[PDB]
């Protein structure tokens, strides 16, 4: 009835997720645990490893190694800001919202979405990089000189907790959508149509988690709670970005990322 509608939307959003995101949790986990045919990830654990595996990998690459890692990261984010916009668009209702609201919800929303989905590429020991081809140990990342050695460790700490909910891509696709339609972003002009859409998402999310994870009591509330940390990691992430800007050079900053950062606080 309405239940069937909720299942329908849950499938719409999953299909779309699968379409918008080249690298799914299903695949990430198959690589991480080596349950695959493709050769294994090339492992960067030190500066020697960094050097050889460097070549076969996803501008001004005359920068030190931390900055080239950082800018490798940020350029992947730019592609990710685009994959996510295309997904937001698939959410029913979304593209009918005031366009200034679609901009805002994306401005404030993409970093929460990025680190949620990047958990799916992490274990407590490293992240998988370049569509699965390489694997950057968490250690090698802590060893990068300040402030770069600080970027990712709060990510891995969140992900290790997040990953313990054991969500799959079907679950992630509604949660992510729930994150984008957040009525509490600053400077939203029309809060009610966005909440009207998120409320239906939430309903869909709750039936998915119970259908999909019957034994896993209060999974919905625990998952929503994670929207709590996340709201945080993001903040210590924006500051960390200011500290790069305060302390670091002429560094190129992509225009798209400029727009997201411009006046977001």
């Amino acid at each position: 009835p309405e239940s069937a509608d909720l299942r329908a939307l849950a499938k719409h959003l999953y299909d779309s997720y699968i379409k918008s995101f080249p690298l799914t949790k299903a695949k990430a986990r198959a690589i991480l645990t080596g349950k695959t045919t493709d050769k294994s990830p090339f492992v960067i654990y030190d500066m020697n490893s960094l050097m050889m595996g460097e070549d076969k990998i996803k501008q001004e690459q005359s920068k030190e190694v931390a900055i080239r890692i950082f800018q490798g990261c940020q350029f992947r984010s730019v592609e990710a800001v685009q994959e996510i916009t295309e997904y937001a668009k698939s959410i029913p209702g979304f593209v009918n919202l005031d366009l200034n609201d679609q901009v805002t919800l994306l401005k404030y929303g993409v970093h929460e979405i990025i680190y949620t989905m990047l958990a799916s590429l992490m274990n407590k020991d490293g992240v998988l990089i370049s569509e699965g081809q390489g694997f950057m140990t968490r250690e090698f990342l802590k060893s990068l000189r300040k402030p770069f050695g600080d970027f990712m460790e709060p990510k891995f700490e969140f992900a290790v907790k997040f990953n313990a909910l054991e969500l799959d891509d079907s679950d992630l696709a509604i949660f992510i959508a729930v994150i984008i339609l957040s009525g509490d972003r600053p400077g939203l002009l029309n809060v009610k149509p966005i909440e009207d859409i998120q409320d239906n998402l939430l309903q869909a999310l709750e039936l998915q988690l119970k259908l999909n994870h019957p034994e896993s009591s209060q999974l919905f509330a625990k998952l929503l709670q994670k929207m709590t940390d996340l709201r945080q990691i993001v903040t210590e992430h924006v500051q960390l970005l200011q500290v790069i800007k305060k302390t670091e050079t002429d560094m190129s900053l992509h225009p798209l990322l400029q727009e997201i950062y411009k006046d977001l606080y």
């Binding site: 800001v81 685009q82 916009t85 295309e86 937001a88 668009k89 593209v95 366009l99 679609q102 901009v103 994306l106 401005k107 225009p255 798209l256 727009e259 997201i260 411009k262």
Partner: peptide
């Protein structure tokens, strides 16, 4: 402003 976002948001 934010033209690059509006740009992605409106491409079909």
């Amino acid at each position: 402003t934010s033209h690059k976002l509006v740009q992605l948001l409106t491409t079909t």
